[PDB]
Amino acid sequence: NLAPLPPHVPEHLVFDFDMYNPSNLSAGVQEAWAVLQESNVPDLVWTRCNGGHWIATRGQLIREAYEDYRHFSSECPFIPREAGEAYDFIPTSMDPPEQRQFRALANQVVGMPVVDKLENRIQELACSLIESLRPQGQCNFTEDYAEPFPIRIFMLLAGLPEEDIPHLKYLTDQMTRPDGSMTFAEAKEALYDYLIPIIEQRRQKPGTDAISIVANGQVNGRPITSDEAKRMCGLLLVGGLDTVVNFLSFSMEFLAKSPEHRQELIERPERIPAACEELLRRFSLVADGRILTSDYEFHGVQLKKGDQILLPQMLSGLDERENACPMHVDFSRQKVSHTTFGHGSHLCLGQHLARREIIVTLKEWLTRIPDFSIAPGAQIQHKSGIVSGVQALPLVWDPATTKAV
Numbered sequence: 001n002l003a004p005l006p007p008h009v010p011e012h013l014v015f016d017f018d019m020y021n022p023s024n025l026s027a028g029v030q031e032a033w034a035v036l037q038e039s040n041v042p043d044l045v046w047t048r049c050n051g052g053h054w055i056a057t058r059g060q061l062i063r064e065a066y067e068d069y070r071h072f073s074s075e076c077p078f079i080p081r082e083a084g085e086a087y088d089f090i091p092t093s094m095d096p097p098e099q100r101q102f103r104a105l106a107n108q109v110v111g112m113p114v115v116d117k118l119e120n121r122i123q124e125l126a127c128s129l130i131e132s133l134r135p136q137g138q139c140n141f142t143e144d145y146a147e148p149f150p151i152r153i154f155m156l157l158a159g160l161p162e163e164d165i166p167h168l169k170y171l172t173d174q175m176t177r178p179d180g181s182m183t184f185a186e187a188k189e190a191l192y193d194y195l196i197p198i199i200e201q202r203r204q205k206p207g208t209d210a211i212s213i214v215a216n217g218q219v220n221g222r223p224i225t226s227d228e229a230k231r232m233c234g235l236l237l238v239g240g241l242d243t244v245v246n247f248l249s250f251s252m253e254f255l256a257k258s259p260e261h262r263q264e265l266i267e268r269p270e271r272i273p274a275a276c277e278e279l280l281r282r283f284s285l286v287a288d289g290r291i292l293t294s295d296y297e298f299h300g301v302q303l304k305k306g307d308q309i310l311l312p313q314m315l316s317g318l319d320e321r322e323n324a325c326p327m328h329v330d331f332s333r334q335k336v337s338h339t340t341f342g343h344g345s346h347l348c349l350g351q352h353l354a355r356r357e358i359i360v361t362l363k364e365w366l367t368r369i370p371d372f373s374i375a376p377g378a379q380i381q382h383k384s385g386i387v388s389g390v391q392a393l394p395l396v397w398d399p400a401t402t403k404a405v
Protein backbone atom coordinates (compact mmCIF):
# COMPACT_ATOMS: atom_id res chain seq x y z
CA ASN A 1 0.00 0.00 0.00
CA LEU A 2 2.00 2.89 -1.42
CA ALA A 3 0.86 6.49 -1.02
CA PRO A 4 1.03 8.92 -3.95
CA LEU A 5 4.32 10.74 -4.27
CA PRO A 6 4.07 14.37 -3.15
CA PRO A 7 4.94 17.01 -5.74
CA HIS A 8 8.25 17.87 -4.08
CA VAL A 9 9.80 14.38 -4.15
CA PRO A 10 12.19 13.72 -7.05
CA GLU A 11 11.32 10.27 -8.36
CA HIS A 12 15.00 9.31 -8.30
CA LEU A 13 14.89 9.67 -4.49
CA VAL A 14 12.13 7.04 -4.13
CA PHE A 15 13.04 3.78 -2.40
CA ASP A 16 10.01 1.94 -1.02
CA PHE A 17 11.31 0.63 2.31
CA ASP A 18 8.63 -0.61 4.76
CA MET A 19 10.12 -0.24 8.25
CA TYR A 20 7.50 -2.71 9.52
CA ASN A 21 8.06 -5.40 6.94
CA PRO A 22 11.37 -4.93 5.17
CA SER A 23 12.20 -7.32 2.36
CA ASN A 24 14.96 -9.75 3.32
CA LEU A 25 13.73 -10.04 6.88
CA SER A 26 14.61 -13.73 6.63
CA ALA A 27 18.32 -12.83 6.63
CA GLY A 28 18.13 -10.86 9.88
CA VAL A 29 16.69 -7.50 10.85
CA GLN A 30 19.92 -5.51 10.85
CA GLU A 31 20.67 -7.10 7.42
CA ALA A 32 17.21 -6.13 6.16
CA TRP A 33 17.71 -2.46 7.05
CA ALA A 34 21.31 -2.39 5.72
CA VAL A 35 19.85 -2.65 2.18
CA LEU A 36 19.40 1.12 2.61
CA GLN A 37 23.17 1.50 2.63
CA GLU A 38 23.95 -0.21 -0.67
CA SER A 39 25.66 1.77 -3.44
CA ASN A 40 22.38 1.93 -5.40
CA VAL A 41 20.67 3.91 -2.61
CA PRO A 42 20.88 7.68 -2.21
CA ASP A 43 21.82 9.11 1.20
CA LEU A 44 18.33 10.45 1.66
CA VAL A 45 15.38 8.58 0.24
CA TRP A 46 11.62 8.84 0.19
CA THR A 47 9.48 5.77 0.84
CA ARG A 48 5.83 5.67 -0.11
CA CYS A 49 5.19 3.03 2.54
CA ASN A 50 3.56 3.86 5.86
CA GLY A 51 2.07 6.95 4.25
CA GLY A 52 5.23 8.44 2.74
CA HIS A 53 8.28 9.71 4.67
CA TRP A 54 11.99 10.38 4.29
CA ILE A 55 14.76 8.09 5.57
CA ALA A 56 18.31 9.27 6.28
CA THR A 57 20.64 6.34 5.46
CA ARG A 58 24.01 7.49 6.73
CA GLY A 59 25.46 8.08 10.15
CA GLN A 60 26.51 11.62 9.25
CA LEU A 61 22.98 12.64 8.23
CA ILE A 62 21.34 10.84 11.15
CA ARG A 63 23.58 12.67 13.63
CA GLU A 64 23.18 16.06 12.00
CA ALA A 65 19.41 15.73 11.94
CA TYR A 66 19.54 14.65 15.60
CA GLU A 67 21.58 17.67 16.59
CA ASP A 68 19.33 20.10 14.70
CA TYR A 69 16.10 20.26 16.79
CA ARG A 70 15.26 23.62 15.22
CA HIS A 71 14.44 21.94 11.87
CA PHE A 72 13.90 18.40 13.04
CA SER A 73 11.31 18.36 15.82
CA SER A 74 10.45 15.61 18.27
CA GLU A 75 6.79 16.73 18.14
CA CYS A 76 5.91 13.76 15.88
CA PRO A 77 8.68 11.20 16.35
CA PHE A 78 6.93 8.08 15.14
CA ILE A 79 5.88 6.88 11.72
CA PRO A 80 3.14 6.47 10.67
CA ARG A 81 1.92 10.00 11.39
CA GLU A 82 -1.15 8.91 13.40
CA ALA A 83 1.18 7.17 15.87
CA GLY A 84 3.66 10.07 15.95
CA GLU A 85 0.54 12.16 16.40
CA ALA A 86 -1.04 10.11 19.20
CA TYR A 87 2.18 10.00 21.16
CA ASP A 88 2.72 12.66 23.70
CA PHE A 89 5.35 10.90 25.84
CA ILE A 90 7.70 13.09 27.91
CA PRO A 91 10.44 14.01 27.36
CA THR A 92 10.48 12.45 23.90
CA SER A 93 7.71 14.49 22.26
CA MET A 94 9.40 17.75 23.31
CA ASP A 95 12.29 19.91 22.08
CA PRO A 96 14.81 21.92 24.10
CA PRO A 97 14.64 24.10 26.06
CA GLU A 98 11.41 22.61 27.40
CA GLN A 99 12.73 19.04 27.27
CA ARG A 100 15.55 19.74 29.78
CA GLN A 101 13.39 20.19 32.90
CA PHE A 102 11.53 16.95 32.29
CA ARG A 103 14.75 15.12 31.45
CA ALA A 104 16.43 16.24 34.66
CA LEU A 105 13.54 14.58 36.55
CA ALA A 106 13.53 11.33 34.55
CA ASN A 107 17.28 11.12 35.21
CA GLN A 108 16.51 11.22 38.94
CA VAL A 109 14.68 7.94 38.45
CA VAL A 110 16.86 5.93 36.03
CA GLY A 111 20.26 7.53 36.30
CA MET A 112 23.68 6.27 37.34
CA PRO A 113 23.06 6.46 41.11
CA VAL A 114 19.96 4.27 40.79
CA VAL A 115 21.76 1.57 38.80
CA ASP A 116 24.48 1.67 41.44
CA LYS A 117 21.91 1.12 44.18
CA LEU A 118 20.22 -1.64 42.16
CA GLU A 119 23.35 -3.53 41.23
CA ASN A 120 23.04 -6.28 43.81
CA ARG A 121 19.46 -7.08 42.78
CA ILE A 122 20.43 -7.15 39.08
CA GLN A 123 23.20 -9.63 39.85
CA GLU A 124 20.97 -11.60 42.21
CA LEU A 125 18.16 -12.01 39.67
CA ALA A 126 20.50 -12.90 36.77
CA CYS A 127 22.27 -15.58 38.81
CA SER A 128 19.00 -17.00 40.10
CA LEU A 129 17.40 -17.10 36.67
CA ILE A 130 20.46 -18.71 35.01
CA GLU A 131 21.05 -21.24 37.81
CA SER A 132 17.41 -22.26 37.46
CA LEU A 133 17.76 -22.85 33.71
CA ARG A 134 21.16 -24.53 33.82
CA PRO A 135 20.26 -28.16 34.57
CA GLN A 136 17.49 -28.18 31.96
CA GLY A 137 19.76 -28.23 28.89
CA GLN A 138 17.12 -26.13 27.07
CA CYS A 139 15.08 -22.92 27.17
CA ASN A 140 13.15 -20.36 25.20
CA PHE A 141 15.71 -17.55 25.92
CA THR A 142 13.06 -15.03 24.90
CA GLU A 143 10.38 -16.13 27.36
CA ASP A 144 12.77 -17.72 29.89
CA TYR A 145 15.34 -14.95 30.44
CA ALA A 146 15.24 -12.01 28.04
CA GLU A 147 11.75 -11.05 29.30
CA PRO A 148 11.73 -11.77 33.04
CA PHE A 149 15.27 -10.43 33.65
CA PRO A 150 14.88 -6.79 32.62
CA ILE A 151 11.17 -6.74 33.27
CA ARG A 152 11.22 -7.87 36.87
CA ILE A 153 14.00 -5.36 37.60
CA PHE A 154 11.80 -2.64 36.11
CA MET A 155 8.73 -3.75 38.07
CA LEU A 156 10.89 -3.53 41.20
CA LEU A 157 12.09 -0.04 40.36
CA ALA A 158 8.56 1.14 39.54
CA GLY A 159 6.99 -0.74 42.45
CA LEU A 160 4.38 -2.40 40.22
CA PRO A 161 3.06 -5.95 40.58
CA GLU A 162 4.63 -8.76 38.57
CA GLU A 163 1.05 -9.86 38.00
CA ASP A 164 0.76 -6.91 35.60
CA ILE A 165 3.51 -8.09 33.21
CA PRO A 166 1.55 -9.97 30.54
CA HIS A 167 -1.01 -7.18 30.17
CA LEU A 168 1.56 -4.41 30.13
CA LYS A 169 3.91 -6.22 27.80
CA TYR A 170 1.14 -6.70 25.24
CA LEU A 171 0.28 -3.03 25.23
CA THR A 172 3.97 -2.21 24.93
CA ASP A 173 4.44 -4.55 21.95
CA GLN A 174 1.51 -3.02 20.12
CA MET A 175 3.29 0.33 20.27
CA THR A 176 6.72 -0.58 18.81
CA ARG A 177 5.75 -3.52 16.66
CA PRO A 178 2.09 -2.90 15.81
CA ASP A 179 0.13 -5.98 14.86
CA GLY A 180 -3.13 -4.52 13.61
CA SER A 181 -5.09 -5.71 16.66
CA MET A 182 -5.43 -2.25 18.16
CA THR A 183 -4.47 1.19 16.76
CA PHE A 184 -1.86 3.52 18.31
CA ALA A 185 -4.25 5.77 20.21
CA GLU A 186 -6.21 2.80 21.60
CA ALA A 187 -3.02 1.16 22.87
CA LYS A 188 -1.91 4.46 24.34
CA GLU A 189 -5.20 4.88 26.18
CA ALA A 190 -5.19 1.40 27.68
CA LEU A 191 -1.71 2.04 29.11
CA TYR A 192 -3.06 5.34 30.35
CA ASP A 193 -6.05 3.62 31.97
CA TYR A 194 -3.55 1.54 33.90
CA LEU A 195 -1.29 4.40 34.93
CA ILE A 196 -3.86 7.01 36.06
CA PRO A 197 -5.20 5.30 39.22
CA ILE A 198 -1.66 4.36 40.28
CA ILE A 199 -0.33 7.89 39.88
CA GLU A 200 -3.27 9.39 41.79
CA GLN A 201 -2.51 6.92 44.59
CA ARG A 202 1.18 7.90 44.68
CA ARG A 203 0.47 11.66 44.77
CA GLN A 204 -1.58 11.18 47.95
CA LYS A 205 0.68 8.51 49.47
CA PRO A 206 4.19 8.61 48.04
CA GLY A 207 6.61 5.72 48.04
CA THR A 208 10.29 5.50 47.14
CA ASP A 209 9.50 3.86 43.77
CA ALA A 210 10.14 5.63 40.44
CA ILE A 211 6.45 6.39 39.93
CA SER A 212 6.15 8.10 43.32
CA ILE A 213 9.24 10.21 42.57
CA VAL A 214 7.89 11.22 39.12
CA ALA A 215 4.31 11.83 40.33
CA ASN A 216 5.69 14.11 43.06
CA GLY A 217 8.53 15.93 41.28
CA GLN A 218 9.32 19.56 40.53
CA VAL A 219 9.68 20.95 37.01
CA ASN A 220 10.62 24.60 36.49
CA GLY A 221 10.07 25.34 40.17
CA ARG A 222 6.46 24.13 40.21
CA PRO A 223 5.01 20.65 40.73
CA ILE A 224 4.47 18.32 37.76
CA THR A 225 0.84 17.89 36.68
CA SER A 226 -0.93 14.53 36.74
CA ASP A 227 -1.05 14.53 32.95
CA GLU A 228 2.70 15.15 32.80
CA ALA A 229 3.45 12.35 35.26
CA LYS A 230 1.21 10.08 33.21
CA ARG A 231 3.14 10.99 30.06
CA MET A 232 6.61 10.42 31.55
CA CYS A 233 5.61 7.14 33.20
CA GLY A 234 4.22 5.93 29.88
CA LEU A 235 7.69 6.33 28.35
CA LEU A 236 9.45 4.72 31.29
CA LEU A 237 7.17 1.69 30.96
CA VAL A 238 7.94 1.16 27.28
CA GLY A 239 11.68 1.63 27.85
CA GLY A 240 11.67 -0.82 30.76
CA LEU A 241 9.55 -3.45 29.01
CA ASP A 242 10.53 -3.42 25.37
CA THR A 243 14.20 -2.51 24.80
CA VAL A 244 16.66 -4.55 26.86
CA VAL A 245 14.38 -7.47 26.29
CA ASN A 246 14.94 -7.46 22.50
CA PHE A 247 18.59 -6.54 22.67
CA LEU A 248 19.58 -9.59 24.78
CA SER A 249 17.90 -11.94 22.32
CA PHE A 250 19.96 -10.66 19.33
CA SER A 251 23.11 -10.83 21.43
CA MET A 252 22.35 -14.32 22.68
CA GLU A 253 21.48 -15.56 19.18
CA PHE A 254 24.87 -14.31 18.05
CA LEU A 255 26.72 -15.91 20.97
CA ALA A 256 24.90 -19.19 20.43
CA LYS A 257 26.30 -19.16 16.86
CA SER A 258 29.88 -17.98 17.57
CA PRO A 259 31.93 -20.25 19.81
CA GLU A 260 35.01 -18.15 19.31
CA HIS A 261 33.35 -15.01 20.64
CA ARG A 262 32.17 -16.91 23.71
CA GLN A 263 35.69 -18.11 24.44
CA GLU A 264 37.20 -14.72 24.04
CA LEU A 265 34.97 -13.38 26.81
CA ILE A 266 35.65 -16.41 29.00
CA GLU A 267 39.40 -15.98 28.84
CA ARG A 268 39.76 -12.24 28.72
CA PRO A 269 36.93 -10.86 30.82
CA GLU A 270 38.57 -7.44 30.62
CA ARG A 271 36.94 -7.32 27.21
CA ILE A 272 33.34 -7.60 28.42
CA PRO A 273 32.73 -3.85 28.39
CA ALA A 274 34.29 -3.51 24.90
CA ALA A 275 32.28 -6.46 23.61
CA CYS A 276 29.14 -4.95 25.06
CA GLU A 277 29.76 -1.81 23.04
CA GLU A 278 30.39 -3.83 19.86
CA LEU A 279 27.20 -5.83 20.27
CA LEU A 280 25.26 -2.61 20.89
CA ARG A 281 26.67 -1.37 17.51
CA ARG A 282 26.03 -4.63 15.55
CA PHE A 283 22.69 -5.51 17.06
CA SER A 284 21.36 -1.94 17.26
CA LEU A 285 17.56 -2.07 17.15
CA VAL A 286 15.76 1.27 17.37
CA ALA A 287 14.40 3.44 14.54
CA ASP A 288 12.39 6.57 15.15
CA GLY A 289 12.35 10.03 13.51
CA ARG A 290 11.48 13.70 13.48
CA ILE A 291 9.07 16.20 11.88
CA LEU A 292 10.07 19.17 9.73
CA THR A 293 9.10 22.45 11.35
CA SER A 294 9.72 24.23 8.05
CA ASP A 295 10.81 24.03 4.44
CA TYR A 296 14.49 23.23 4.67
CA GLU A 297 17.22 22.21 2.32
CA PHE A 298 19.21 19.34 3.72
CA HIS A 299 22.23 18.00 1.87
CA GLY A 300 20.70 19.25 -1.38
CA VAL A 301 17.26 17.66 -0.84
CA GLN A 302 14.27 19.95 -0.38
CA LEU A 303 12.26 19.10 2.72
CA LYS A 304 8.75 20.46 3.23
CA LYS A 305 7.35 21.59 6.58
CA GLY A 306 5.39 18.65 8.03
CA ASP A 307 7.31 15.93 6.24
CA GLN A 308 8.41 13.19 8.62
CA ILE A 309 11.87 11.70 8.38
CA LEU A 310 13.03 8.37 9.82
CA LEU A 311 16.50 8.75 11.36
CA PRO A 312 17.34 5.09 12.12
CA GLN A 313 19.60 5.00 15.19
CA MET A 314 20.29 1.39 14.14
CA LEU A 315 21.93 2.57 10.87
CA SER A 316 24.79 4.74 12.07
CA GLY A 317 26.98 1.93 13.38
CA LEU A 318 26.23 -0.28 10.36
CA ASP A 319 27.48 2.47 8.05
CA GLU A 320 30.73 1.42 6.40
CA ARG A 321 31.92 5.07 6.41
CA GLU A 322 31.74 4.76 10.22
CA ASN A 323 32.85 1.20 10.86
CA ALA A 324 35.01 -0.94 8.54
CA CYS A 325 33.34 -4.32 7.86
CA PRO A 326 30.13 -3.35 9.67
CA MET A 327 28.46 -6.74 9.74
CA HIS A 328 31.50 -8.32 11.41
CA VAL A 329 31.66 -8.52 15.22
CA ASP A 330 35.10 -7.56 16.47
CA PHE A 331 35.60 -7.07 20.18
CA SER A 332 38.95 -5.37 19.66
CA ARG A 333 37.85 -2.61 17.27
CA GLN A 334 39.84 0.56 17.90
CA LYS A 335 36.65 2.63 17.79
CA VAL A 336 33.08 1.32 18.04
CA SER A 337 30.96 4.11 16.57
CA HIS A 338 27.19 3.91 17.03
CA THR A 339 24.17 5.96 18.05
CA THR A 340 22.31 2.96 19.55
CA PHE A 341 21.14 5.08 22.51
CA GLY A 342 20.34 8.07 20.28
CA HIS A 343 22.18 11.32 19.72
CA GLY A 344 21.63 14.97 20.55
CA SER A 345 19.49 16.17 23.45
CA HIS A 346 17.35 12.99 23.50
CA LEU A 347 20.16 10.68 24.48
CA CYS A 348 18.91 7.59 26.29
CA LEU A 349 18.68 8.19 30.06
CA GLY A 350 18.33 4.42 30.54
CA GLN A 351 21.64 3.54 28.89
CA HIS A 352 23.47 2.98 32.19
CA LEU A 353 20.82 0.58 33.40
CA ALA A 354 20.75 -1.24 30.04
CA ARG A 355 24.57 -1.58 29.94
CA ARG A 356 24.58 -2.96 33.48
CA GLU A 357 21.93 -5.51 32.56
CA ILE A 358 23.85 -6.63 29.47
CA ILE A 359 27.24 -6.94 31.12
CA VAL A 360 25.78 -8.91 34.06
CA THR A 361 24.01 -11.27 31.67
CA LEU A 362 27.12 -11.94 29.55
CA LYS A 363 29.38 -12.49 32.57
CA GLU A 364 26.91 -14.65 34.45
CA TRP A 365 25.64 -16.71 31.56
CA LEU A 366 29.11 -17.54 30.25
CA THR A 367 30.22 -18.44 33.77
CA ARG A 368 27.60 -21.20 34.18
CA ILE A 369 26.73 -22.10 30.60
CA PRO A 370 29.84 -21.58 28.48
CA ASP A 371 28.68 -23.89 25.71
CA PHE A 372 25.31 -23.61 24.06
CA SER A 373 23.73 -23.48 20.65
CA ILE A 374 20.53 -22.85 18.76
CA ALA A 375 18.18 -25.82 18.81
CA PRO A 376 18.42 -28.03 15.72
CA GLY A 377 15.82 -27.10 13.11
CA ALA A 378 14.80 -23.91 14.90
CA GLN A 379 14.00 -21.09 12.50
CA ILE A 380 14.82 -17.78 14.25
CA GLN A 381 12.52 -14.96 13.20
CA HIS A 382 13.28 -11.29 13.60
CA LYS A 383 10.55 -8.66 13.68
CA SER A 384 10.95 -5.07 12.46
CA GLY A 385 9.50 -1.86 13.87
CA ILE A 386 10.26 1.12 16.07
CA VAL A 387 12.09 -1.42 18.24
CA SER A 388 13.12 -4.64 16.47
CA GLY A 389 12.76 -8.04 18.12
CA VAL A 390 13.30 -11.80 18.01
CA GLN A 391 10.16 -13.98 18.03
CA ALA A 392 11.61 -16.89 20.05
CA LEU A 393 15.10 -18.19 20.79
CA PRO A 394 15.20 -21.95 21.45
CA LEU A 395 18.64 -22.86 22.88
CA VAL A 396 20.10 -26.27 23.84
CA TRP A 397 23.13 -27.34 25.83
CA ASP A 398 24.61 -30.32 27.63
CA PRO A 399 24.07 -29.90 31.38
CA ALA A 400 27.30 -31.86 31.86
CA THR A 401 29.21 -28.92 30.42
CA THR A 402 27.68 -26.40 32.78
CA LYS A 403 29.15 -25.07 36.01
CA ALA A 404 27.13 -24.40 39.15
CA VAL A 405 28.10 -21.42 41.27
Ligand code: HEM
Pocket (backbone or CB within 6 Å): 077, 090, 091, 092, 099, 103, 106, 110, 235, 236, 237, 239, 240, 243, 244, 247, 285, 286, 288, 289, 313, 339, 340, 341, 342, 343, 345, 346, 347, 348, 349, 350, 351, 353, 354
Ligand atom coordinates in the same frame (compact mmCIF):
# COMPACT_ATOMS: atom_id res chain seq x y z
C1 HEM B 1 19.17 -1.53 24.81
C2 HEM B 1 18.33 -0.69 25.30
C3 HEM B 1 17.87 0.68 24.88
C4 HEM B 1 18.06 1.33 23.73
C5 HEM B 1 18.76 0.84 22.44
C6 HEM B 1 17.48 2.66 23.86
C7 HEM B 1 17.43 3.61 22.87
C8 HEM B 1 16.92 4.87 23.02
C9 HEM B 1 16.86 5.89 21.94
C10 HEM B 1 17.41 5.59 20.53
C11 HEM B 1 16.38 7.00 22.49
C12 HEM B 1 16.19 8.39 21.84
C13 HEM B 1 14.95 8.50 20.94
C14 HEM B 1 14.77 9.77 20.22
O1 HEM B 1 15.75 10.54 20.08
O2 HEM B 1 13.59 9.94 19.77
C15 HEM B 1 16.05 6.73 23.88
C16 HEM B 1 15.60 7.65 24.80
C17 HEM B 1 15.19 7.39 26.08
N1 HEM B 1 15.49 6.20 26.78
FE1 HEM B 1 16.35 4.56 26.02
N2 HEM B 1 16.97 2.82 25.14
C18 HEM B 1 17.13 1.58 25.76
C19 HEM B 1 16.78 1.35 27.09
C20 HEM B 1 16.14 2.19 27.97
C21 HEM B 1 15.73 1.89 29.36
C22 HEM B 1 15.99 0.59 30.07
C23 HEM B 1 15.08 2.97 29.80
C24 HEM B 1 14.52 3.30 31.19
C25 HEM B 1 13.30 2.81 31.48
C26 HEM B 1 15.05 3.97 28.71
C27 HEM B 1 14.66 5.27 28.87
C28 HEM B 1 14.84 6.33 28.02
C29 HEM B 1 14.26 7.64 28.13
C30 HEM B 1 13.67 8.20 29.44
C31 HEM B 1 14.59 8.31 27.01
C32 HEM B 1 14.27 9.77 26.67
C33 HEM B 1 15.33 10.82 26.93
C34 HEM B 1 14.88 12.21 26.42
O3 HEM B 1 13.94 12.29 25.60
O4 HEM B 1 15.50 13.13 26.93
N3 HEM B 1 15.80 3.47 27.67
N4 HEM B 1 16.43 5.45 24.18
Ligand SMILES: CCCCCC[C@](O)(Cn1ccnc1)c1ccc(Cl)cc1Cl
Pocket (backbone or CB within 6 Å): 077, 078, 087, 088, 089, 092, 093, 176, 235, 238, 239, 242, 243, 286, 287, 288, 289, 313, 348, 350, 386, 387
Ligand atom coordinates in the same frame (compact mmCIF):
# COMPACT_ATOMS: atom_id res chain seq x y z
C1 LIG C 1 6.90 7.92 20.86
C2 LIG C 1 7.69 8.83 21.82
C3 LIG C 1 8.46 8.03 22.89
C4 LIG C 1 8.86 6.62 22.41
C5 LIG C 1 8.67 5.56 23.51
C6 LIG C 1 10.00 4.96 24.02
C7 LIG C 1 10.59 3.88 23.06
O1 LIG C 1 9.46 3.23 22.46
C8 LIG C 1 11.36 2.79 23.86
N1 LIG C 1 12.58 3.37 24.54
C9 LIG C 1 12.54 4.42 25.43
C10 LIG C 1 13.80 4.68 25.86
N2 LIG C 1 14.60 3.81 25.29
C11 LIG C 1 13.87 2.99 24.45
C12 LIG C 1 11.46 4.47 21.95
C13 LIG C 1 12.12 3.60 21.07
C14 LIG C 1 12.92 4.08 20.03
C15 LIG C 1 13.08 5.45 19.85
CL1 LIG C 1 14.07 6.04 18.59
C16 LIG C 1 12.43 6.33 20.72
C17 LIG C 1 11.63 5.86 21.76
CL2 LIG C 1 10.87 7.05 22.74
